[PDB]
Nucleic acid binder design. Sequence first.
RNA 1: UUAAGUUAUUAAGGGCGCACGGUGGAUGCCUUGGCACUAGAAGCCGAUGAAGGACGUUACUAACGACGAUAUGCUUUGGG
RNA 2: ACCGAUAGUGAACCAGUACCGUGAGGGAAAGGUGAAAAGCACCCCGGAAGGGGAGUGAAAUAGAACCUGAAACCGUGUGCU
RNA 3: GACAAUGGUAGGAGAGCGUUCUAAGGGCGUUGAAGCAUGAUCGUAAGGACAUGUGGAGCGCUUAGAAGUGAGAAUGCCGGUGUGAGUAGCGAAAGACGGGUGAGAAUCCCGUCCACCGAUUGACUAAGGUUUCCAGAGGAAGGCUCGUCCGCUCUGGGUUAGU
RNA 4: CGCGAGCUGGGUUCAGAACGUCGUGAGACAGUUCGGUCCCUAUCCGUCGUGGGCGUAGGAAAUUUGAGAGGAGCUGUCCUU
RNA 5: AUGAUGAGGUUAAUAGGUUCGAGGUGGAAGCAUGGUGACAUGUGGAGCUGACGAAUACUAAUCGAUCGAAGACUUAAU
Lengths: 48, 120, 43, 112
Amino acid sequence: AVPKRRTSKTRKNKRRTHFKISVPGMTECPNCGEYKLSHRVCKNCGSY
Amino acid sequence: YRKLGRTSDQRKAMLRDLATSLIISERIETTEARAKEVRSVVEKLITLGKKGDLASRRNAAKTLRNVEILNEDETTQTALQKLFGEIAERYTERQGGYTRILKQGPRRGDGAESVIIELV
Amino acid sequence: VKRTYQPNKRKHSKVHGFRKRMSTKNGRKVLARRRRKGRKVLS
Amino acid sequence: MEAKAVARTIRIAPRKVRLVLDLIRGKNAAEAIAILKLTNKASSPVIEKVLMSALANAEHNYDMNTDELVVKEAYANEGPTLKRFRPRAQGRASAINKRTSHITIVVSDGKE
RNA sequence: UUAAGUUAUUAAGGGCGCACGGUGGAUGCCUUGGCACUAGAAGCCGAUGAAGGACGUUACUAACGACGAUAUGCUUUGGG
RNA sequence: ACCGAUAGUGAACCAGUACCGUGAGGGAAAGGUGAAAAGCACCCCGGAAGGGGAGUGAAAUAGAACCUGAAACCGUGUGCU
RNA sequence: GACAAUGGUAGGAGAGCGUUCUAAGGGCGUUGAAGCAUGAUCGUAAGGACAUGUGGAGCGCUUAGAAGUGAGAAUGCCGGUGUGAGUAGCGAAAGACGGGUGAGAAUCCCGUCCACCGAUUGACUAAGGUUUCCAGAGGAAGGCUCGUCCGCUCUGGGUUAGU
RNA sequence: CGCGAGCUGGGUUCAGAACGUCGUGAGACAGUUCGGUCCCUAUCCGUCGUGGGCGUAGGAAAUUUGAGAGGAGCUGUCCUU
RNA sequence: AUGAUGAGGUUAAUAGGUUCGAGGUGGAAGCAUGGUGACAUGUGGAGCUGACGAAUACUAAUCGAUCGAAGACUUAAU
Ligand SMILES: [Mg+2]
Ligand SMILES: [Mg+2]
Ligand SMILES: [Mg+2]
Ligand SMILES: [Mg+2]
Ligand SMILES: [Mg+2]
Ligand SMILES: [Mg+2]
Ligand SMILES: [Mg+2]
Ligand SMILES: [Mg+2]
Ligand SMILES: [Mg+2]
Ligand SMILES: [Mg+2]
Ligand SMILES: [Mg+2]
Ligand SMILES: [Mg+2]
Ligand SMILES: [Mg+2]
Ligand SMILES: [Mg+2]
Ligand SMILES: [Mg+2]
Ligand SMILES: [Mg+2]
Ligand SMILES: [Mg+2]
Ligand SMILES: [Mg+2]
Ligand SMILES: [Mg+2]
Ligand SMILES: [Mg+2]
Ligand SMILES: [Mg+2]
Ligand SMILES: [Mg+2]
Ligand SMILES: [Mg+2]
Ligand SMILES: [Mg+2]
Ligand SMILES: [Mg+2]
Ligand SMILES: [Mg+2]
Ligand SMILES: [Mg+2]
Ligand SMILES: [Mg+2]
Ligand SMILES: [Mg+2]
Ligand SMILES: [Mg+2]
Ligand SMILES: [Mg+2]
Ligand SMILES: [Mg+2]
């Protein structure tokens, strides 16, 4: 139930090495505008 | 089929109110899973409209809510009359389809994949 | 579940409050003790 | 020359803002805007507003070429927290830490 | 070339060292306030309504001092 | 040959006051811009907050949480691994 | 110069080091004191210097006094700050779409549809609460999310009795 | 007398009550009898699954060798002889 | 569970839709007839059918983007 020992600063940072985030789609909209998310229709600042 | 996070009657009531409003306005903005499932609902309901007989008039009113459209020149047709009269005349040659799903970005309160479902 | 202190504006003013403390000598003792602390509200 | 902007005492917690802030650092200034417009984190409209502010301090104050700039530094420090309480069960409160952040991005073109 | 043998390069991450930040309010210095006394007074008022208060009173007013309807003061004698 | 702000009265701060208790009663925490407010005119980003300039000042990492800012803790870089 | 001794707990003895203050003497400081930070310096020890940053006014030294004089431990006290951990939770429940609003809308407004209560989640009225009431205005904090809304904040209003 | 941070709680050391017995008594028995709240969000090790990284001296795709490890392993009845 | 695994991504049958089935239910609605009626019978194994089968590009699998080798020495035969 409770942790018997504290986790160190080293063990904590080894656990959250897969606690990351990915870069998204980022495809250009060839008609007009900035980068749209891939396989998505744009809403603002683009023509998809 | 998808359960959409609801009961058998909460899903059924949600899915025919979402199919009625896609007859009223002809393009609605929903989430992605709720548009994957109302896709097969309204396409099976335009199939009843292309028939146009009385027996399938009774079947399209199983599903459609009693919603009145204010059309042009202050004339009012119901969503049952608008299904057999306007959508049924548009797709009388096409053998399927009748909708498309255009994906959009996540919402702000959720990561819910926004989707426009249109009527083609 | 019903708690203690169901409030009442009459009983609070009549078992506490100034004219009750002043009616007995030991209640003028509690008033003298609150004047000596500098307690802003008496009774 | 470098151009920086900060955002002090942003109510997003420092752990939650350093996720998306690791995605944009080292990258050029044009594509860092596109990452911050497409990630659906809460911090993505906030770092983007700070990256707009440091690209504007480059063009205006230091007359840099904003087309060719790269994000050198992109970090978030801890700010002062707001210590809130929370009633749980049996008269027993528990502390909730409303953490804040000092978000800082600096931008440069790598030349002296 | 084929064997046989040896030794790397990797750092997702971590460690140590260094550098630069942030949080945080220790420490240094400071004192309006206290502390212990000394000397000199004095000690306790009130039915002529006390001690305490409560409401008020400034051009704008919340609080605290100040003063009560003559109210953020009045008169008078002296300082200035 | 008393205290220097966790001390010294509970109280150096609009203290027996926030607050707690039905009540008696219990009872805090919270001093420091600069010599002088000269407290940042204007410009830029931003809805605003915030910043970047410019400007004041001996000093602005003295910008009103404002004298110094120590550790825990959180970071970003790295040389060797 | 020989020779000898030198493990050590309760405990006994001895010699010291630092701390704040006082006295006298002698000093150092905006040409930058105390602190603070760093360093590869010195002493047998507690310790002492020096250099360089920071810092922006005090402080050493000698001798002798005085003590609130030395902390790692007391389920110590008071402050901060982690760990668990981006984990548990987010407090009974049906919403959907369109329009609008805006820096920004799953949550705000309007509309339709659907659903729920209906001897009540409906009306009054006591107690109790005190201004939460009403208008505009706002979005820091509060709301277990969001927020353009609010019982929140700002400004201005609002309670009339011979029965 | 394996196993309750795996489960029950019938047994029993709780407060109630009753009988027998003992004690002047309050009570007691280790005599009965009826009733009597079973807390924990898994940090580490260990286990059951499952990914990522890197190595395997070019990089890939596919088929395999098995050093090893694990699983299995019971038995009746009847008929002929 | 997640992710992995597998089928596909337009030169495409991946999923949906459409069309045709399979299986399921048991005779739809409407109309006609008969019955005073409740109801029967006909039209008619009728209608309907979620995951199953086949066909069909009708809709959607867009445009894109990222990663990825250059083959070390030593000696021995050749
Ligand atoms: Mg990490
Ligand atoms: Mg139902
Ligand atoms: Mg890395
Ligand atoms: Mg008398
Ligand atoms: Mg201090
Ligand atoms: Mg004190
Ligand atoms: Mg500003
Ligand atoms: Mg400084
Ligand atoms: Mg000063
Ligand atoms: Mg400071
Ligand atoms: Mg010895
Ligand atoms: Mg001794
Ligand atoms: Mg100077
Ligand atoms: Mg200096
Ligand atoms: Mg000193
Ligand atoms: Mg110095
Ligand atoms: Mg001591
Ligand atoms: Mg301790
Ligand atoms: Mg998670
Ligand atoms: Mg989450
Ligand atoms: Mg856990
Ligand atoms: Mg879990
Ligand atoms: Mg959860
Ligand atoms: Mg709720
Ligand atoms: Mg209101
Ligand atoms: Mg209002
Ligand atoms: Mg909020
Ligand atoms: Mg409002
Ligand atoms: Mg155990
Ligand atoms: Mg008993
Ligand atoms: Mg007897
Ligand atoms: Mg019972």
